[PDB]
Amino acid sequence: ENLYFQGMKKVFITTGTEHYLRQLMENYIGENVTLLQNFSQSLLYQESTGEKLFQEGKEYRVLQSSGSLKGFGIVVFEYIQLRDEEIPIFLQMYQHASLHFSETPGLQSTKLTKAMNTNQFLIVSFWDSEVFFQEWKKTPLHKEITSIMKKNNTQVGFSHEDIYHYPEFS
């Protein structure tokens, strides 16, 4: 089995107003669901195994994962487009880099994912605070992600870095 193509571990990402997404959370209470927010927008992040079926949001296949979500801090979404020729190289490099994620200060968890049926990749990283993420920007992995993000951008919204935080405590 080639899990790049056939893997069943997924991330679903649904954007919307806080009110809508809080209703959506109510309907999927007791699921793997996290509400995140930034200045513009709210987002629901879920990990699950299987298919989207009728569920909302955009689906990404998880290729590589590390760590575990602690439920606080900031979450960074790095969307990049890879050319076919780059994919084996990038996956190997990322796997080698990931051997050192446990030594990366403030890094809780990472997900390397691919949009279903396309060459758009999404790297999700969970951090204790933005300070730790800003330090990580100094690393070769961040530099190469940034390079690809700029070089391969087809200018239709598939390449961007979005930062979210956990919502106000209620």
Q: How far apart are CA 120 and CA 94, in angstroms?
A: 16
DSSP string for 102-168: GGSTTEEEEEEEEETTSSEEEEEEEESSHHHHHHHTTSHHHHHHHHHHHHT--SSS--EEEEEEPPP
The domains found in the chain, sorted by start residue, are 1-170 (3.30.70.100)
Q: How far apart are CA 76 and CA 155, in angstroms?
A: 20
Q: Are 35 and 25 in contact (CB under 8 A)?
A: yes
Q: Are 62 and 8 in contact (CB under 8 A)?
A: no
Q: How far apart are CA 50 and CA 70, in angstroms?
A: 23
DSSP string for 48-85: EES--TT--SEEEEEEEEEE---S-SEEEEEEEE--GG
Residue appearing with tokens 């490099």: 93
